[PDB]
């Protein structure tokens, strides 16, 4: 009746997703924009439009909040006009021209040699990859080149009258004089991860007592999909119990998300201690560094 040491693995399943309460585009990937897998209600969308061909299509929107999406690629020209528009280009090498017009527009480039015209208002461009993947140059015409390698080739996108740029790593205030990008502090950052653990004592006399998470920022909320599992106190710790068949020799917790306040630490080590028991106890632990 000696508790045998189990095996535990923790895995960051993706990079942190910074979310901003004041920017509904935050946490929406280019892919989700191109597929329509986001909440159009958060943007007050009143009309939706697509392109038609695999070549340069011109789609004009309405004076209302329009969703216009390149479903067939080719490098389409989208005119948003008035209203707060969501203009989503495609991923062909040939550029989209996305003209936001008046209102506060979301201009989603996709891949390729895209031209993004914010127009009047406070406009946001959504670019793929991280800010660090992009070279900014000033143009003679007052616009900016955003150079990025896509498919091992250097591509140039041009941005005009865009106040904000959203990358995978967050939203930046864009200085339209000198092309400075200044990081905006997120409201929260979602860190997705998984825990898997198994007993080395395989006769059913042992169960997992608990999974103890440590090293987490105070005020962080752990989720399993929908469910709130717990809020991280002063001590940086959560004791997990009852999230598995209690009989099981092997535990896999998936769909876990740690939502960290933006004011909390941009770097920490998430440690898991898997505790095996029968009267006596034994532990193993693993860590992942979260950025
Ligand atoms: Ca044992
Ligand atoms: Ca098209
Ligand atoms: Ca397109
Ligand atoms: Ca419109
Ligand atoms: Ca507009
Ligand atoms: Ca594009
Ligand atoms: Ca605009
Ligand atoms: Ca603008
Ligand atoms: Ca045993």
Author numbering: 4168 to 4458
According to the publication:
Here, using this criterion and an AlphaFold3 model of a 5047-residue RTX adhesin from Aeromonas hydrophila, we identified three different ligand-binding domains in this fibrillar protein. In both of these bacteria, the adhesins are single polypeptide chains of the repeats-in-toxin (RTX) family that are exported through the Type I secretion system but anchored to the bacterial surface by a retention domain that folds internally and is then too large to pass through the channel of the T1SS. The crystal structures of the two novel domains were solved to 1.4 and 1.95 Å resolution, respectively, and demonstrate excellent agreement with their modeled structures.
Budding out from this second split domain is a 17-kDa putative ligand-binding domain (dark red), which AlphaFold3 suggests is an RTX-type beta-roll containing nonapeptide Ca2+-binding sequences. After these, another split domain begins (colored pink) that leads into a second putative ligand-binding domain (colored dark red) before returning to finish the split domain (pink). These two domains were expressed together, purified, and crystallized. The first section of the beta-roll domain is a short alpha-helix that runs parallel with, and leads into, a short beta-solenoid domain composed of tandem RTX nonapeptide repeats with a consensus sequence X-G-G-X-G-(N/D)-D-X-(L/I/F)-X that together bind nine Ca2+ ions on the inside of the solenoid. After four coils of the beta-roll, the domain ends in a short beta-sandwich motif before the polypeptide chain returns to complete the split domain (colored yellow to red). There is no obvious ligand-binding site on this domain, but based on observations of other split + ligand-binding domain combinations, its binding site is likely to be the most solvent-exposed surface. It bound to only one glycan slightly above background levels. It did not bind to any of the microorganisms tested, nor to the erythrocytes, but it did bind in patches to all three human endothelial cell types. AhLapRTX appears to be a novel ligand-binding domain, and there are as yet no indications of what macromolecules it might adhere to. When the crystal structures of the two putative ligand-binding domains (red and gold ribbon) are overlaid on their AlphaFold3 models (green ribbon) to compare their folds, the agreement between individual domains is extremely close, with RMSD values of below 0.5 Å.
